[PDB]
Each structure stands twice: as structure tokens, then as C-alpha cells.
Ligand SMILES: Cc1cc2nc3c(=O)[nH]c(=O)nc-3n(C[C@H](O)[C@H](O)[C@H](O)COP(=O)(O)OP(=O)(O)OC[C@H]3O[C@@H](n4cnc5c(N)ncnc54)[C@H](O)[C@@H]3O)c2cc1C
Ligand SMILES: Cc1cc2nc3c(=O)[nH]c(=O)nc-3n(C[C@H](O)[C@H](O)[C@H](O)COP(=O)(O)OP(=O)(O)OC[C@H]3O[C@@H](n4cnc5c(N)ncnc54)[C@H](O)[C@@H]3O)c2cc1C
Ligand SMILES: CNCCCC(=O)c1ccc(O)nc1
Ligand SMILES: CNCCCC(=O)c1ccc(O)nc1
């Protein structure tokens with residue numbers, strides 16, 4: 051039996067396990083899959099032999115993501131930007147300008163005013179309290195309704211909606227305004243910052259950091275799916291799909307929120323958590339790597355397409371590239387390549403699609419979703435509580451970060467807190 | 476004897492006189508100078524025979540200035556923009572972009588944040604209450620100190636300071652932050668709007684409108700300088716530099732604030748007004764028309780020069796133009812043409828200065844100043860009170876507008892209110 055069992059071998063689990071180990075605790079890490087890293091998943095391209103790609107989490111910004119920056123410095127892990135953006139091919143209407151910030155002068159006043167309104171609203175959020183504890187319910191409404199009250203002209207309206215679609219992984223009618231404002235608050239109260247945090251990538255893949263961290267973790271079991279966590283006795287018992295149990299004084303749940311509902315907790319989790327847990331969050335983010343021919347380097351496209359964003363990812367050859375598109379899996383079927391072709395040619399009518407690569411995170415039983423985003427009304431009912439301990443079971447992960455939810459940084463942050471909580475008695 | 480005497484034949488006096496006349500009152504307008512229009516002064520160029528120029532007020536924006544827009548529609552008075560701006564020659568440092576909005580991407584986050592801060596502060600101002608009645612004293616500090624707390628990077632910092640210098644007619648150390656915020660509030664809570672209200676000009680000069688209005692005013696005396704206003708009796712007595720008095724039930728003071736201190740009021744004006752009146756406001760605006768050779772059309776220059784702004788005004792010929800520069804008369808001596816040459820060549824090293832035209836508003840005894848701007852600390856002590864009646868004497872004018880101070884629109888607004896006050900008993 052162990053001081054602590056960590057369930058899940060993403061960045062959160064890995065951090066918690068390593069740090070508890072270095073503190074002299076006896077730790078076991080159980081990972082249900084065949085690999086470590088979770089929603090950070092670098093691997094060989096399905097389309098391009100010998101090419102390493104990120105199929106989940108990839109981007110970081112050292113200034114918004116200091117714990118991650120610390121990890122990188124700690125292990126000497128190189129980063130860079132994946133591409134310079136120099137060619138802008140927007141679909142925002144005839145008055146848009148082809149630049150990174152495509153808003154024309156005739157919209158400037160409208161943007162100014164909306165900027166003030168969004169940031170005012172964002173400043174209502176205190177990041178330590180939880181979204182359900184601050185009288186923020188009036189903001190917990192469908193994003194499209196919120197944006198309708200800003201009454202933006204066409205370019206700025208579509209620009210904001212596109213990036214919101216991209217970033218939340220939900221269409222505007224399903225996204226919560228409060229959640230959009232949450233991401234603005236997490237970026238030091240900045241709208242710009244949300245998109246500007248796409249700043250660098252791992253030069254050798256996320257696996258670089260995953261492997262570094264795992265090297266400091268003495269006991270790991272892969273292919274070990276936790277099905278049960280029972281703290282009815284003096285010591286927590288963790289049952290596993292095989293049926294061969296492990297015991298510890300403390301258990302860290304570092305699996306995705308949308309998979310909690312498949313674990314049997316004993317006793318049952320506190321009742322106010324239960325409904326949201328059963329439902330799951332509404333995240334439907336979809337990231338598609340697109341192998342193309344005839345694309346110039348450095349393309350960025352933002353617009354009103356079924357892909358709100360489409361931008362440069364990497365050089366394959368003199369004539370071939372990968373692009374990345376974001377949409378959501380409720381709106382778009384990535385296995386309909388004809389659809390892919392249509393969505394790309396909308397922005398880039400000269401380009402030929404050669405193929406696509408993605409991971410169906412929502413269909414994967416180890417995840418049941420991409421990154422976190424609430425359904426409308428969820429997190430103004432319960433949010434902080436999701437990542438609070440239930441007796442000796444701690445809940446960590448990006449999904450439950452108050453400080454940086456949906457980011458690698460949030461995984462690290464939450465791990466920090468569980469480790470400290472465990473070290474204090 | 477008259478229902479009303481109006482003192483001053485600027486837009487405020489003219490409006491008040493006309494409207495009282497049309498209401499069936501018996502009105503006399505006394506103007507101390509040889510012309511009507513006051514600080515709106517179109518006349519022939521000192522530099523270019525046969526050319527009409529604006530030596531004071533010139534610019535308007537129909538959307539911010541609806542009363543003025545009404546006047547223009549009423550008399551069929553044509554307007555246009557004086558020039559397209561197409562060539563940007565800024566002195567804002569090597570990272571500036573040569574566009575109307577010269578802020579580069581690396582400053583975007585900083586600007587976003589400052590935008591929120593300025594507008595938040597501006598939203599503290601309710602435009603009907605007066606700046607001395609709202610607990611705004613913490614904002615009534617030197618602009619440079621306020622701007623230092625925004626901690627802007629270099630381009631945005633200098634850009635904001637330049638336009639503030641231009642617009643307030645005061646260097647940053649003498650300008651009040653609260654007053655800058657007042658102009659932001661007057662423009663429907665917009666920073667951009669302050670500069671965007673430079674939108675059209677009178678196609679035939681301000682005198683077009685002045686002449687239209689004066690045609691509706693049956694009794695006008697020019698060269699009649701008021702020296703005394705005495706309401707100790709039942710009927711107000713207005714003494715005049717000649718010594719030949721006029722009497723009325725009501726008197727409208729529509730002369731500039733900085734000339735009130737030369738009038739003998741009986742009884743004395745209410746005591747809390749007296750000190751600011753004696754001191755005068757701190758407006759030192761200076762507008763210089765510059766006759767040039769070798770300038771391309773459509774130039775706008777903003778920067779850190781002794782002229783914060785320098786921009787296109789009109790075509791004289793294929794090789795000659797007028798530009799306009801704003802600075803202030805405490806900082807700059809317009810009769811030092813060598814200085815003028817230096818200030819222009821800073822932005823435009825290829826251009827030859829042929830000559831200059833301006834009016835020394837501060838030296839003119841009928842004005843003692845250009846447009847209104849408070850000294851630091853003035854208007855958070857007394858501001859609304861300056862434009863309130865003292866018994867039967869009303870105070871109007873741009874100088875005292877709560878709603879649009881320093882603009883033609885403010886002259887019209889204040890006249891509106893005095894007329895209505897007089898019509899009601
Ligand atoms: C398409 C996509 C793109 C992204 N892009 C970015 C980005 O650019 N930048 C950024 O910062 N973030 C990005 N993210 C978000 C980020 O990758 C995740 O928030 C983060 O990796 C989550 O780490 P974690 O430790 O919370 O959970 P995960 O990485 O999900 O780890 C959970 C672990 O639990 C395991 N598991 C599940 N059920 C069980 C079970 N019952 N028993 C045992 N193990 C179990 C899973 O196998 C997994 O290894 C992206 C996410 C996705 C899906
Ligand atoms: C250089 C400059 C540029 C400007 N640019 C713009 C601009 O682009 N757009 C804009 O909207 N505004 C502009 N303004 C501000 C605007 O012109 C004025 O606020 C407005 O014209 C003031 O009108 P008024 O009726 O309040 O006062 P004024 O126009 O000053 O009228 C005052 C009248 O009082 C007379 N007078 C003074 N003392 C006496 C006395 N004792 N007895 C009898 N008569 C007396 C004066 O002769 C004058 O005719 C500018 C002002 C200046 C100086
Ligand atoms: C840099 N600004 C462009 C807007 C989006 C963005 O910043 C971005 C997008 C992709 C990428 O790899 N790097 C940056
Ligand atoms: C249009 N934007 C440029 C900034 C200043 C400005 O708007 C301006 C200046 C002079 C003029 O005649 N018209 C407009």
C-alpha cells in the first residue's frame with residue numbers, strides 16, 4: 051500500500067506523482083492507456099511518414115503559463131513558434147483588412163466600446179472563488195445572445211465569434227458567455243491575450259516533457275483502468291478493470307472530468323457535484339491537421355466558415371504543408387473529406403487537400419471529450435466544488451482549474467494544489 | 476429697454492439672441508469687436524491672397540454635434556472634409572506604423588488594458604452634474620502623472636500624449652487628467668471619438684453660418700464693449716465702454732470665461748466662482764496655419780515634436796499647401812519662424828516653410844484665451860456653478876458647457892439652456 055495513488059498519466063497526474071515522490075512519499079501512478087501524456091499527444095503523422103505532430107495540446111505562452119515555463123527550464127526542453135504568420139486570407143467580408151487584426155477603421159469605435167464592456171464583465175470574475183460563488187448567473191447565457199447585446203458590426207462580430215468558436219470548441223449557441231469571460235480573466239484580463247497565448251510549441255513534441263517527467267516517477271502502471279474508488283475504510287481502495295486492487299492513504303483523480311461518471315465512488319460524491327458529473331461538460335473542440343498542396347507558407351485564415359480558423363502548422367516539402375483547423379465535433383464530421391475540402395477551399399480556393407489527421411477525443415473512452423467547456427448554466431451552479439477533495443480523494447486536472455482551465459497550465463496548477471494539500475497532513 | 480441683452484456675438488450669443496427673438500422677445504445683442512463669430516473666425520489668408528481660412532474653430536462631426544448639424548441643415552450650409560489623409564509621417568519611434576492608428580502589435584495588449592482603464596475612469600463622469608459635484612478630485616491631477624500610472628509603451632504613450640497636447644492646448648504637466656476624461660465622456664464615452672470628431676469643415680467658412688444666424692437678429696451693436704452689469708435695481712443695467720448704457724430684464728453673458736474678470740458685476744458674483752474667474756482657465760491652445768512648398772497631399776504627422784500634430788489643411792497650388800499645426804502658446808512662439816521651420820522639418824525634412832498665419836487669442840482683449848481647459852484642480856472645485864445664473868444674469872458659452880466644452884456644439888448647447896430658462900418666467 052502507498053501514501054498516494056494517482057489516477058491518470060497526463061501532465062496533472064505526472065506532476066502530482068513526481069512531486070509527491072520527491073517529497074519522500076510512496077506513490078503509485080495508474081494510467082488506463084498505453085501511453086503517458088493524455089490530451090497532450092505527440093506522435094507520427096497519419097499522412098506524412100517520419101513527421102511528428104501534435105494531435106492534442108501543443109501551444110503555450112511562457113508569460114501566461116509560468117508553471118509550464120518552469121517545467122521546460124527544469125528539463126532543458128526546447129520550444130519555438132511553429133510558423134511565422136505572414137499571409138492573411140480571411141473570410142470576414144469585403145471591408146476586412148488582410149492582417150492579423152483585420153478590423154477596419156470604420157469599426158474602431160464599436161470595438162473600443164465592446165472592449166470596455168467585455169473587460170468590465172470579465173473583471174467581475176475573481177479567479178479564486180469559483181464561478182458558482184460570485185453572482186455571475188446573469189452572464190451564464192448563450193454566447194450568441196451575449197454577443198447580440200454588444201451589437202458589433204460585421205467584421206469585428208465575426209472575428210470575435212470565430213475565435214470564440216475555435217477557443218471554446220463550441221458553436222456560439224451552445225457556448226456560455228461567462229466561460230468566454232473566464233478565459234479572458236485567466237489571461238490577466240485580456241481579450242487579445244487569449245489568441246496571443248498561441249505563442250510557442252515543443253520543438254520535439256509534448257512527449258519530450260512527458261518523458262522527462264515520467265523518468266522521475268518510480269512506479270507506473272499502464273493499461274490499468276480504474277473502475278472504483280472506495281474510501282469507506284481507513285485506507286482508500288482502488289479497484290481496477292482486471293479486478294486487482296491497490297490501496298493508499300490518499301487518492302488523486304487526475305482523469306478527465308467527463309470520465310468520472312464511469313468510476314464507482316464509495317461513498318458517493320457530494321450531491322451537488324453529481325448532476326454535472328453525470329452530464330459532463332459540453333466541450334466539443336475538434337482539431338484537424340490537414341495535409342495540403344499548393345499552400346503558401348505562413349497562412350492564417352479567420353472567418354465565418356465551418357472552420358472558423360485555419361492556419362499554418364508546418365512545412366512538409368516545397369509544395370506540401372500541414373495546416374490546422376479548429377471547429378467542433380457537433381458541427382463537423384472530419385471523416386467526410388468532401389466536407390473538409392469544401393471548408394478549406396472556402397478560405398483557400400487554390401489549395402488541394404491530400405489528407406487529414408485527428409483524434410476523436412469524444413469517442414475515446416479514456417477521455418469522452420477534448421478540453422473543458424461548460425454547457426450553459428453548468429458552472430454558475432457548480433464549479434469550484436468539482437475540484438475540491440471529497441474526504442481523501444482529490445480531483446485535479448485542466449478540466450477543473452480555476453486559474454487556467456482547458457490549458458496545460460491548468461493541469462499543472464491543480465496538481466500543485468493537491469500535492470500541497472496532501473503534504474499538509 | 477429690452478426683454479434681454481445678449482453680451483457677445485459668437486455662436487452662443489447669436490443662438491440665444493435669435494431664439495429669444497423668434498420667441499417674440501425684444502432682444503439686443505452687444506458685440507465688443509468689429510465682427511460676429513468670436514472664436515469661430517474665417518477670413519482671408521495672411522499668406523495666400525484670395526484664400527479663405529479658419530483661424531479658430533473649424534471642425535465638426537454631425538453625430539457628436541447634433542445642434543450644430545441642425546443649424547447647418549436649417550440654413551442649407553455646405554460642409555465637407557478639408558482633406559483625405561493618406562500619407563503618415565509620424566515621429567513615434569522606429570516600431571511605429573505609418574498609418575492613422577500607428578500602434579504596433581507588440582503594444583496591443585498594453586493598449587487594450589489602458590483603453591479599459593481610461594474608459595472606466597471616464598464612466599465616473601456624469602455629464603449633467605458638474606465636475607465639482609462627483610467626488611472626482613482623485614482624477615484632477617496633472618495628465619503626465621495620470622499617464623505615468625498607465626505605464627504605456629513608447630508608441631502608444633507618445634501617441635496619446637501628442638493628441639492630448641493638441642486637443643487640450645496644454646502640455647502634459649499642466650493639463651488635468653479629469654479634463655481629458657471629460658472630453659472622452661463628451662464623445663459618448665470614447666477615446667477614439669475625440670480625434671474622430673475632426674470630421675468635416677464649413678465649405679465656405681464658419682462665416683456662412685454666422686451670417687445666416689445674424690440675419691435673423693434685428694438689433695446688433697458692434698464695437699460695443701460691456702464693462703459693467705448691475706442687477707441691483709429692478710431692471711438690469713449694462714454699462715458700456717463709451718459710457719452709454721442699456722437696460723433689460725435679463726442679461727446673457729456670452730463672452731469668453733477669461734474676460735469675465737474685466738466686467739464689473741453688481742452685486743458681485745457668488746463667492747465660490749470668484750477665484751476661478753479671477754484666475755481664468757489654463758487653455759493655451761495654439762493653431763498655426765503653415766504655408767508650405769514641397770509637401771505631398773494628405774499628410775498627417777503625429778509625434779513627440781514641439782508640434783505634437785501637423786496635418787494637411789488645403790491645396791494652394793500644384794506645389795504649395797497649407798498645413799495646420801497645434802501646440803500651445805506657453806511652449807511655442809509662433810513669431811519665431813526659425814522655430815516653426817525646425818518644428819515642421821522634424822516631421823517633414825523635405826518641406827519648405829513659406830509663412831505662417833494665426834491669431835494670438837490669448838493676447839486679444841476680447842478673448843484672453845483660446846478654447847477652455849482648466850488648470851489642475853480648478854474644475855473639481857467649481858465648474859457647473861460657472862454656467863449657472865446669478866439672479867437675472869445667465870452665463871453661456873462653450874467655455875461653460877457641461878456637455879460639450881471647448882466645442883462649437885457647447886456654445887449652442889449652453890445657449891439652448893439660457894433661452895429655455897428665460898422663456899420659463
Ligand atoms: C485537441 C486538443 C488541443 C489542445 N490544445 C492545447 C494547447 O494548444 N495548449 C494547451 O495548453 N492545452 C491544449 N489542450 C488542453 C490540454 O491538452 C489538456 O487540458 C491537458 O493535457 C489535460 O491534462 P490532464 O492531466 O488534466 O488530463 P489528460 O491529459 O486528459 O490526462 C488524463 C489521463 O487519464 C487517463 N484515464 C482516463 N480514465 C482513466 C481511468 N478510469 N483509469 C486510469 N486512467 C484513466 C487517460 O488515459 C489520461 O492519460 C488541448 C486539448 C485537446 C483535446
Ligand atoms: C484656435 C481655436 C480652434 C478651435 N477649433 C475648433 C474646432 O475645430 N471645432 C470646434 O467645435 N470648436 C473649435 N474651437 C472652439 C470654438 O471655436 C469656441 O468654443 C466657440 O466658437 C466659442 O463660442 P462662444 O459663443 O462661446 O464664444 P466666442 O466665439 O468667444 O464669442 C465671444 C464674443 O464675446 C465678445 N466679447 C468679449 N468681451 C466682450 C465684452 N466685454 N463686451 C462685448 N462683447 C465682448 C468677443 O468679441 C466674441 O465675439 C476652436 C477655438 C480656437 C480658439
Ligand atoms: C499572432 N497572431 C495571429 C492570431 C493567431 C495567432 O497568434 C497564432 C496562430 C497560430 C500560431 O501558430 N501562432 C500564432
Ligand atoms: C481620420 N483620422 C486621422 C486622425 C486625425 C483625423 O482624423 C483628422 C485630422 C485632420 C482632418 O482634417 N481630418 C481628420
Ligand SMILES: CN1CCC[C@H]1c1ccc(O)nc1
Pocket residue numbers: 109216217248335359376421456457
Ligand atoms: C489554447 N487552447 C486551450 C484548449 C484548446 C487550445 C487551442 C489551441 C490552438 C487554437 O487555435 N485554439 C485552441
Ligand SMILES: CN1CCC[C@H]1c1ccc(O)nc1
Pocket residue numbers: 534641642673760784801846881882
Ligand atoms: C476640436 N477642438 C475643440 C477645441 C480645439 C479643436 C481642435 C481642432 C483640431 C485639432 O487638431 N485639435 C483641436
